[PDB]
Amino acid sequence: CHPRLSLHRPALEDLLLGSEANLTCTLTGLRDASGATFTWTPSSGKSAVQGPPERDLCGCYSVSSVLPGCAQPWNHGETFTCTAAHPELKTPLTANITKSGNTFRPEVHLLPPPSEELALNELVTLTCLARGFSPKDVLVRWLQGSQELPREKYLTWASRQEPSQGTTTYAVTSILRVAAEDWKKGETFSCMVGHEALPLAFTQKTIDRLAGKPTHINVSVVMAEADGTCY
Amino acid sequence: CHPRLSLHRPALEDLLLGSEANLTCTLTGLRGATFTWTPSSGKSAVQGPPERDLCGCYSVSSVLPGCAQPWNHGETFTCTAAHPELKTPLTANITKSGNTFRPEVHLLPPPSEELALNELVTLTCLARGFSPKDVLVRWLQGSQELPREKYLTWASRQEPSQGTTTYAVTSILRVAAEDWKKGETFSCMVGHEALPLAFTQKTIDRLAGKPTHINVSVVMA
Amino acid sequence: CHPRLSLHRPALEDLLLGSEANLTCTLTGLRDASGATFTWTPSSGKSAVQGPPERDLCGCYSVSSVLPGCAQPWNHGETFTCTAAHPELKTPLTANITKSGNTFRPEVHLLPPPSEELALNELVTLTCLARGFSPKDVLVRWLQGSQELPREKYLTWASRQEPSQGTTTYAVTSILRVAAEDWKKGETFSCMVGHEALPLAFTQKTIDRGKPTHINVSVVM
Numbered sequence: 260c261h262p263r264l265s266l267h268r269p270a271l272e273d274l275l276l277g278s279e280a281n282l283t284c285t286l287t288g289l290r291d292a293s294g295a296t297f298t299w300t301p302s303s304g305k306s307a308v309q310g311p312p313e314r315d316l317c318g319c320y321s322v323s324s325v326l327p328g329c330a331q332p333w334n335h336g337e338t339f340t341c342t343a344a345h346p347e348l349k350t351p352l353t354a355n356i357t358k359s360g361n362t363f364r365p366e367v368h369l370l371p372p373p374s375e376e377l378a379l380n381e382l383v384t385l386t387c388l389a390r391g392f393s394p395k396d397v398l399v400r401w402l403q404g405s406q407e408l409p410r411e412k413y414l415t416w417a418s419r420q421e422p423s424q425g426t427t428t429y430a431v432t433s434i435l436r437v438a439a440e441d442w443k444k445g446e447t448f449s450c451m452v453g454h455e456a457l458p459l460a461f462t463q464k465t466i467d468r469l470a471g472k473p474t475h476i477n478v479s480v481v482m483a484e485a486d487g488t489c490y
Numbered sequence: 491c492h493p494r495l496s497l498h499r500p501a502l503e504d505l506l507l508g509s510e511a512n513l514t515c516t517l518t519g520l521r522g523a524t525f526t527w528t529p530s531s532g533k534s535a536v537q538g539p540p541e542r543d544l545c546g547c548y549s550v551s552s553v554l555p556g557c558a559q560p561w562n563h564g565e566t567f568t569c570t571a572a573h574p575e576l577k578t579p580l581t582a583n584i585t586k587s588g589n590t591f592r593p594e595v596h597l598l599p600p601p602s603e604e605l606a607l608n609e610l611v612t613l614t615c616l617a618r619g620f621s622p623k624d625v626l627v628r629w630l631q632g633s634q635e636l637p638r639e640k641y642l643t644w645a646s647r648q649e650p651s652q653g654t655t656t657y658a659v660t661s662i663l664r665v666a667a668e669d670w671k672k673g674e675t676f677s678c679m680v681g682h683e684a685l686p687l688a689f690t691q692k693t694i695d696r697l698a699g700k701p702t703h704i705n706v707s708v709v710m711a
Numbered sequence: 712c713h714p715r716l717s718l719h720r721p722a723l724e725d726l727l728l729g730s731e732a733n734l735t736c737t738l739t740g741l742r743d744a745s746g747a748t749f750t751w752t753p754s755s756g757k758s759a760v761q762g763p764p765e766r767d768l769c770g771c772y773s774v775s776s777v778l779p780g781c782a783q784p785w786n787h788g789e790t791f792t793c794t795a796a797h798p799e800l801k802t803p804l805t806a807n808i809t810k811s812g813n814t815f816r817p818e819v820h821l822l823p824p825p826s827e828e829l830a831l832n833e834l835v836t837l838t839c840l841a842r843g844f845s846p847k848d849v850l851v852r853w854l855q856g857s858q859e860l861p862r863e864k865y866l867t868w869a870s871r872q873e874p875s876q877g878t879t880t881y882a883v884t885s886i887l888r889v890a891a892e893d894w895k896k897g898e899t900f901s902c903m904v905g906h907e908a909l910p911l912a913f914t915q916k917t918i919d920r921g922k923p924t925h926i927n928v929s930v931v932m
C-alpha cells in the first residue's frame with residue numbers, strides 16, 4: 260500500500276574489521292519503478308546506485324540506494340540526510356541518522372565447563388556472555404590456541420534487552436563444543452567481543468583446565484633475605 | 491489477493507500446565523467460509539470473530555478445542571476448508587513428532603570478577619540437544635516462583651552438528667548481592683515434550699564454587 | 712450394619728501426569744437387583760458408565776458410577792453432585808464433593824549417609840523427607856543422572872498426619888539403597904515430590920559428595 264522511508268546504520272563488521280562503510284536508504288511502496296534520485300547533504304561522490312527492486316506480499320516494488328566512504332564522518336560525529344522525489348505522496352519524504360551517544364561498554368565473562376560433562380568424556384561446552392552495553396550491535400569470535408576457528412563451529416544468539424535497573428542495556432550469548440581429550444592435554448580457548456564503546460574495539464578472556472574450577476590451589480611464596488640492608 | 495491455509499500445533503504452556511489445548515486452522519483471503527474436521531470428536535468449533543494483516547487480505551481463523559488426549563495418543567488431524575474464491579477445497583494435516591530427544595540442563599555459578607563490586611550476581615541456565623524446538627523456562631527463589639518480568643530468555647536456535655538436528659536455548663537471572671551472601675537458594679526449571687515427568691530442575695547457592703583444598707607455603711629462606 | 716454413600720476424588724497420578732480424570736460413586740453390600748439408578752446432577756453430555764459387576768464379601772454386589780472428562784471443571788472450582796435410587800433402597804440419597812482450599816506447600820529434604828555404614832562399604836541409604844502440606848496426596852519418584860529408576864528399587868510409607876500446633880499438616884518418607892562403587896565414583900541421584908499446591912506441580916532435590924574445604928599453610932624457616 261502506501262510508501263514509507265527508512266534509514267539504516269552502517270554494518271558493525273565493516274567499521275571494525277573493514278575498509279569501506281556504506282550507508283543505505285530504502286523506500287518501500289513503489290508501484291513499478293520511478294524517477295527517484297536521492298539527496299544526501301554531504302555529497303562528496305554520491306554514487307547512489309539503486310539496482311533491481313525486490314518483490315513483496317502479493318507483488319510490490321521496493322528500491323534502495325547506497326553511499327560509500329563513511330568512516331571519519333560517522334566516527335567524528337557528522338550527520339546525514341536522505342530524501343527522494345516520487346509520485347505516490349504529497350511531499351517528498353525525509354530521514355536522518357546520527358551515531359549514538361550515552362553508551363556503555365560490555366562486561367565479558369567466560370565460564371568453565373560444568374562438572375558433570377567432564378566425566379562422560381565425549382565433548383565439553385564453553386559459554387561466553389556479554390552484558391550491559393547500550394547500542395545493540397556486537398561481534399563474537401572464538402580462538403583455539405592462537406588460531407581463529409571458522410564460523411560454523413559455534414552458535415551465537417541475538418542481542419536482546421534485559422530487565423531494567425536504571426538505564427536500558429542489552430546482552431548476548433554463545434557456545435562452543437570441543438573434544439574432551441584436548442581439555443586435558445592443556446590447550447587454551449579464548450573469546451573475543453567487538454563493540455563500539457570499547458577502547459581499541461576488541462577485548463578477550465581466556466580459560467583452560469587449571470584456571471576455572473580447579474579443585475586444587477597450589478601456591479608457593481618465597482621471601483629471600485628479609486633482614487637484608489634494604490636500600 | 492492470494493489464498494493460503496495452515497495448521498498449528500497446540501501451545502506448550504497449555505499442554506503442560508492447564509490442559510485446555512486448542513488447535514488452529516487459518517485462512518488468509520476474502521479480497522462466508524466453512525471448515526471441516528475429519529476426526530469427529532463431538533464438540534464442534536467456533537469461527538473467528540476476522541481481523542486483517544499486512545495492509546491487505548483480512549484473514550479468518552477457526553479453532554477446534556478439547557483435543558489434548560488425542561494429540562498425545564498419536565492420532566492424526568486434518569482440516570478441510572471451502573471458499574468462493576477456491577476452485578477445490580484446500581486440505582492440510584498435522585501429526586505429533588517422532589524420534590524425539592530430551593534436553594540436558596546446566597546451571598552455572600557466577601564469575602568471581604563479579605562479586606567484587608557488591609551490586610548483583612548473575613546466574614546462567616543452558617539447555618542443549620533436544621529434537622522438537624519448543625520449550626519453557628521458569629525461575630524460582632526458594633519456593634516462590636518469580637514473575638516473568640524479572641529475567642531474560644533467548645529463542646531456540648539450531649546447533650551445528652553433523653549427526654542429527656538439535657536445538658539450544660539460554661537464560662539469565664540477576665539477583666541481589668545481599669541475598670546471595672545470606673545463603674538463599676535459586677532454581678531453574680525446563681519443560682519439554684520429550685521428558686518423562688515434563689519438568690527438570692537444577693539449583694545453586696553460595697557454596698559449590700568454592701574449591702576443595704588450598705595449599706599455601708611461605709619459605710623464609 | 713449398612714453403608715451410606717459418599718464421593719471420592721480423582722487420582723493424583725492421572726491428574727498430574729496429564730492423562731485424564733474420573734469420579735467415582737459407590738454403594739454396596741447385598742446381592743440385589745440391577746436397578747442401581749446412578750444419576751449425575753452436572754453432566755456435559757457424556758454421562759457415566761454403570762461399571763463392572765464387582766463382588767465383595769458374602770456376595771456384596773458392587774457396581775459404581777464413573778464419568779470421564781473432569782479436569783477443567785474440577786480445577787477451576789465447580790461443585791459436583793451424585794444422587795442414586797435402588798430397588799431395595801427406593802429412598803434416594805445424595806453426596807457432594809468440592810476441591811479443597813487452605814493449601815500449604817511442602818518442604819523436601821534429602822539427607823546424606825550414617826557414618827557407620829560409610830565405613831562399611833557395603834550399601835548406603837538415602838532418605839527423602841517431605842513435611843507440611845495440606846491434603847494427604849503426594850507422589851514420590853527417584854532418579855539417577857537423567858534416567859528414571861523403576862518403582863521397585865525403593866519403598867515409601869503412607870502419609871501420616873503430624874501432631875503440632877493449630878492446623879493439620881502431613882508428612883511422608885522414602886529410602887533408596889545403592890551400591891558403593893558408583894557412589895564413591897561420583898554418580899548422582901534425585902528425589903522428586905508431586906503435590907497440587909506447587910505452581911509447577913513438582914520439585915526435585917539432588918545430593919552428591921557437602922564436605923568442607925581443607926586449608927594447609929606451612930612456614931619453613
Ligand SMILES: *[C@@H]1O[C@H](CO)[C@@H](O)[C@H](O)[C@H]1NC(C)=O
Binds near residue numbers: 354
Ligand atoms: C531528525 O528527524 C526528525 C523527524 O524525522 C526530527 O524530529 C528531528 O528534529 C531531526 N533531527 C535533526 C538533527 O535534524
Ligand SMILES: *[C@@H]1O[C@H](CO)[C@@H](O)[C@H](O)[C@H]1NC(C)=O
Binds near residue numbers: 581582583584
Ligand atoms: C498428510 O501428512 C502426510 C505426512 O504425514 C503428507 O505426506 C500428506 O501429503 C498429508 N495429506 C494428505 C494425506 O492429504
